[PDB]
Write a protein that binds this DNA or RNA. Structure first.
Ligand SMILES: Nc1ncnc2c1ncn2[C@@H]1O[C@H](CSCC[C@H](N)C(=O)O)[C@@H](O)[C@H]1O
Ligand SMILES: Nc1ncnc2c1ncn2[C@@H]1O[C@H](CSCC[C@H](N)C(=O)O)[C@@H](O)[C@H]1O
Lengths: 246, 244
DNA sequence: TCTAGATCTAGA
DNA sequence: TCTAGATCTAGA
């Protein structure tokens, strides 16, 4: 098992065995909600179309893909004892919010992800990252994970777009894996988009493109995914894998 | 630290360490602007005189002090999923505004404080509470905080009166802590702000220490010119100590 | 994920 | 002068 280099709310590392068990085979895997990329990192498709609405995330991935050595070098300098304190963390959070440079923002993004509170990635309505200091003994610098990501990324394309747009990219040889923000147990993922996601999936399988969706197992998701074969993963509420197979 | 059971604009929980560092010792603590009472709840004076101009607040505190179990039981019934929606919130707001019963108003006051917009407590000129719905996922019911408040309240007296009147209650064994509405970065006027400092000067002349907290501005530096000023840490906070 | 809470704004 | 809605902010 390969770990993602980012800590991420909704990370699927623990559910990889269950996901892979139900994920059909194909030439290409499309992930409309790539997040930290645990599925991408633990599968063997010949190519990937990885997308997410988070622009900082997609920019970061392209930089890791194309400028690996420069990135690892710059990022590694921030993972020292000297940056592990509140005064430094908040100055870097401010530096990040004021910068318009893709490379520096990407470098700081990793620092904030691992020195910040519980690995949260959160912004206010003005687009400013506002996660507080996480007070860790020693954040782990994901050097091996970054190199592995960059290697796998040579067969991927990253897109910053909403799910309806990346899913429209799927074709005959694609398999689509959707891991939308969790459903209930502004400027976020709504219940209407949750329902709409299921609708697009029904449209794709009608065209012989398989789709697997992961979400909590609730009365609502049961309803949204009524046209899929449901698989429960016992784990609080259980996890659900809705498979739309041609 | 102990949390107040009400959410409250101007709450001093984050500033408790700083306040206590400069608050003198004595038998009795007088708080002319008690608000949610975080200082009262995190100090250990033998007795307290707690006052505020808000009548609903003082009425509520007396009910919590004297009828703790009945109050908690009644209040707890409103902290359920079924009351967490706009339709119910606005009907309870109207119920509160039409009621003249101290107990029911006290019970609804807590509901409105935690289901309403950002813990605001606001009324129009007709005396009607007009804070909108706050749309929280699950407002916290402060059961532990209510019991602690009631316990501490056994050594307090609550008064609904303006600051000049409660400060006149201080005597030889009193320490006065004032947390007036914040100074600009009826309502609380700049004249009352200045008047407050004047009373403090009169109290310390009589050997009664007074600590006042406010924002650190050029106006407050002027009002509290006769005090020993301490700056804490958005503008900085100022603690003005009038020590005999 | 939980939680307190220093405002802003249009306008019969 | 006032009324009354606001679907957030940011630390832990
Ligand atoms: N409308 C939208 N379109 C595409 N992605 C979206 C979206 N709304 C939210 N997201 C993205 O949804 C992702 C859910 S987390 C997915 C995590 C991933 N399976 C892993 O294992 O790491 C987040 O990264 C979020 O940025
Ligand atoms: N003239 C006046 N006399 C007494 N209290 C007044 C007043 N004008 C306003 N107030 C009260 O001033 C309080 C300021 S908030 C004080 C908060 C308190 N220290 C805490 O930690 O919770 C409010 O509760 C308000 O009702």
């Amino acid at each position: 098992k390969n770990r993602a280099f980012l800590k991420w709310a909704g990370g699927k590392y623990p559910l990889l065995d269950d996901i892979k068990r139900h994920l059909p085979k194909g030439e290409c895997l499309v992930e409309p909600f790539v997040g930290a990329g645990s599925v991408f990192l633990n599968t063997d498709f010949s190519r990937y179309i990885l997308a997410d609405i988070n622009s900082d995330l997609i920019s970061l991935y392209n930089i890791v893909k194309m400028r690996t050595d420069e990135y690892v070098q710059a990022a590694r300098e921030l993972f020292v004892p000297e940056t592990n304190c509140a005064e430094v963390y908040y100055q870097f959070r401010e530096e990040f919010n004021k910068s318009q440079d893709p490379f520096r923002r990407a470098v700081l993004f990793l620092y904030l992800n691992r020195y910040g509170y519980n690995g949260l990635c959160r912004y206010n309505l003005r687009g400013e990252f506002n996660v507080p200091f996480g007070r860790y003994k020693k954040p782990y610098f994901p050097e091996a994970e970054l190199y592995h990501f960059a290697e796998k990324a040579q067969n991927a394309f990253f897109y910053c777009e909403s799910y309806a747009d990346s899913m429209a990219r799927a074709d005959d040889s694609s398999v689509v894996y959707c891991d939308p923000p969790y459903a209930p147990l502004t400027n976020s993922f709504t219940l209407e988009q949750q329902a709409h996601l299921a609708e697009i999936a029904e449209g794709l399988v009608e065209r012989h493109i398989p789709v697997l969706i992961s979400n909590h197992d609730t009365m609502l998701t049961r309803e949204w995914y009524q046209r899929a074969k449901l698989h429960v993963v016992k784990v609080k509420v259980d996890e659900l894998l809705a498979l739309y197979k041609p």
